[PDB]
């Protein structure tokens, strides 16, 4: 179904673009949304896909339209738009001036100095999965790694014990991956089930724990309700989960089917945190989006009170007018410019602690199975959507180039 053209939107600026399934998706994700950025397409283009809505499809438009909440709210952050009405978690759904208060209650719990303490245990974790996997000369990286990984560290942070895991990584599958048992909104609320009852004795007996400091919060002046802290543990909870899965196997896809990038990164292990940085670039993952809060004239187009405008975070980086060779990697770029984490009001909050999880992983995998190749035979399929990813990563290695 393409939705049918609204008036206000000019034939020649149509691009039915399909972020949930578009046309070069075999030739890799990234690749398949940069086609948006061929020359025959403007800076900004309108698809009649997924009911309708705008596409910024250049760096400097998508970083404009960021900055300017005032006129492209996160009230309504999702396309399909029926997705961004029913999204409610904190602070993604809120504009500033209320949003401030949020992250920087959230900030409190994810933030730099919290990273700098947690990072020997993320370490510890990433060794403990790695040298159970390292004997077998095989894994699902995305699966055997990279799913278990992320939600390790939440359990950490936010003081919750492993017993848990199973049972939390089922809800949050849910939410990004349904199998029918329930809907979103049965997930959310068994999420909320779960983490009520822990923030009620953590405000009764605090920790010097995410869910802890999350509930004895101040916001406004006057302390943060129930519904707010769950609706805040919940993005705390999805919101390092399936970027940093998606974006830990794109990774190590291309490690895997470049020995030349592995083999520098081997020999030059201080190169590891400027790699990092060049393959949040290259495989960059998320394309969320906004809505237009009144009429407004954005770079010599008409956008309507109520349209939603998808900025993909992904594109800036790719963008040949930010990065030179924008599909090439170089781990020595001067420059590396991107979006990948987002930009303005809302940039992610995780982030230190996703660079922190990438590089330690990169660091430690590389150090206990340096030779490593895509499983003989298979190929490589990539998913797109509001965080893009990877099926499935089958990776091998000879054992006895290993180390123990
Ligand atoms: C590769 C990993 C990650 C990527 C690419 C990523 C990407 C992003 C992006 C693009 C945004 C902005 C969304 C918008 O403007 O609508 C965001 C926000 C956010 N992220 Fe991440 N993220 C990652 C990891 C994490 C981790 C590990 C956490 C820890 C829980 C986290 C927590 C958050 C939170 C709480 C926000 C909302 C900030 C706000 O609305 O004020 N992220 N992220
Ligand atoms: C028929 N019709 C209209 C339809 C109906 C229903 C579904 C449809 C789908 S669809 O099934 O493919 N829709 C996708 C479901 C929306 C995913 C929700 C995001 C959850 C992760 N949340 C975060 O808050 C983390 C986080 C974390 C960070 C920051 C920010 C953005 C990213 C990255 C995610 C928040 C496709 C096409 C049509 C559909
Ligand atoms: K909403």
Same mark, same amino acid.
């Given at each position: 179904?393409?939705?049918? *053209? =609204? =008036?206000?939107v000019?034939?020649?600026?149509?691009?039915?673009?399909?972020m949930?399934?578009?046309?070069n998706?075999?030739?890799?994700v990234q690749?398949?949304?940069?086609?948006?950025?061929?020359?025959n397409v =403007?800076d900004?283009?309108?698809?009649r896909?997924?009911g309708?809505?705008?596409?910024?499809?250049?760096?400097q438009?998508?970083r404009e339209?960021? +900055?300017?909440?005032?006129?492209?709210?996160?009230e309504c952050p999702?396309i399909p738009?029926?997705?961004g009405?029913a999204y409610?978690?904190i %602070?993604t759904?809120?504009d500033p001036?209320?949003? $401030? /208060?949020?992250?920087?209650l959230?900030?409190?719990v994810?933030?730099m100095?919290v990273?700098?303490?947690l990072?020997?245990?993320?370490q510890?974790?990433?060794?403990?999965?790695?040298?159970?996997?390292?004997?077998?000369?095989?894994?699902?990286f995305?699966?055997?790694?990279?799913?278990?990984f =992320?939600?390790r560290?939440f359990?950490?942070?936010?003081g919750?014990?492993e017993?848990?895991?199973?049972?939390?990584?089922?809800l949050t599958?849910?939410?990004?991956?349904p199998?029918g048992s329930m809907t979103?909104?049965?997930?959310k609320?068994?999420l909320?089930?779960?983490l009520? %009852?822990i923030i009620?004795?953590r405000?009764?007996? %605090?920790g010097?724990?995410?869910i802890?400091?999350?509930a004895?919060?101040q916001?406004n002046?006057?302390?943060?309700?129930?519904?707010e802290?769950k609706?805040?543990?919940?993005?705390? *909870?999805?919101?390092?989960l399936?970027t940093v899965?998606?974006?830990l196997?794109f990774s190590?896809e291309?490690?895997a089917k470049?020995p030349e990038h592995?083999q520098?990164?081997?020999? #030059?292990?201080? #190169?590891?945190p400027?790699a990092?940085?060049?393959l949040?670039r290259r495989?960059?993952?998320?394309?969320?989006?906004?809505i237009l809060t009144?009429?407004?004239?954005?770079?010599?187009?008409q956008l309507?009170?109520?349209?939603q405008?998808?900025?993909? /975070?992904?594109?800036?980086?790719?963008?040949?007018?930010?990065?030179?060779?924008?599909?090439?990697?170089?781990?020595? $770029?001067?420059?590396?410019?991107?979006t990948?984490?987002?930009?303005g009001?809302?940039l992610?909050?995780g982030?230190?602690?996703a660079?922190? +999880?990438?590089?330690?992983?990169?660091?430690?995998?590389l150090?206990?199975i340096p030779?490593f190749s895509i499983?003989?035979?298979?190929?490589?399929q990539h998913?797109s959507?509001?965080?893009?990813?990877?099926?499935?990563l089958?990776?091998?290695?000879?054992?006895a180039?290993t180390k123990?």
């Amino acid at each position: 179904n393409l939705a049918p *053209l =609204p =008036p206000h939107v000019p034939e020649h600026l149509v691009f039915d673009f399909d972020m949930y399934n578009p046309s070069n998706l075999s030739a890799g994700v990234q690749e398949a949304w940069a086609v948006l950025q061929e020359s025959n397409v =403007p800076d900004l283009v309108w698809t009649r896909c997924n009911g309708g809505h705008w596409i910024a499809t250049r760096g400097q438009l998508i970083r404009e339209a960021y +900055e300017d909440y005032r006129h492209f709210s996160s009230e309504c952050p999702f396309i399909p738009r029926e997705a961004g009405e029913a999204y409610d978690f904190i %602070p993604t759904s809120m504009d500033p001036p209320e949003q $401030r /208060q949020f992250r920087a209650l959230a900030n409190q719990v994810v933030g730099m100095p919290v990273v700098d303490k947690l990072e020997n245990r993320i370490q510890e974790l990433a060794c403990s999965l790695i040298e159970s996997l390292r004997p077998q000369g095989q894994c699902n990286f995305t699966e055997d790694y990279a799913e278990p990984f =992320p939600i390790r560290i939440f359990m950490l942070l936010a003081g919750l014990p492993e017993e848990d895991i199973p049972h939390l990584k089922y809800l949050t599958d849910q939410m990004t991956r349904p199998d029918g048992s329930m809907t979103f909104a049965e997930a959310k609320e068994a999420l909320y089930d779960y983490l009520i %009852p822990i923030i009620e004795q953590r405000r009764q007996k %605090p920790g010097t724990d995410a869910i802890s400091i999350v509930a004895n919060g101040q916001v406004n002046g006057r302390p943060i309700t129930s519904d707010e802290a769950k609706r805040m543990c919940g993005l705390l *909870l999805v919101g390092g989960l399936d970027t940093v899965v998606n974006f830990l196997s794109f990774s190590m896809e291309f490690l895997a089917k470049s020995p030349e990038h592995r083999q520098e990164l081997i020999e #030059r292990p201080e #190169r590891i945190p400027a790699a990092c940085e060049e393959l949040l670039r290259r495989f960059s993952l998320v394309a969320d989006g906004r809505i237009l809060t009144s009429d407004y004239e954005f770079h010599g187009v008409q956008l309507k009170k109520g349209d939603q405008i998808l900025l993909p /975070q992904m594109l800036s980086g790719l963008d040949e007018r930010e990065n030179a060779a924008p599909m090439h990697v170089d781990f020595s $770029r001067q420059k590396v410019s991107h979006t990948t984490f987002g930009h303005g009001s809302h940039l992610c909050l995780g982030q230190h602690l996703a660079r922190r +999880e990438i590089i330690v992983t990169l660091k430690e995998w590389l150090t206990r199975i340096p030779d490593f190749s895509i499983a003989p035979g298979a190929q490589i399929q990539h998913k797109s959507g509001i965080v893009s990813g990877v099926q499935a990563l089958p990776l091998v290695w000879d054992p006895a180039t290993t180390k123990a």
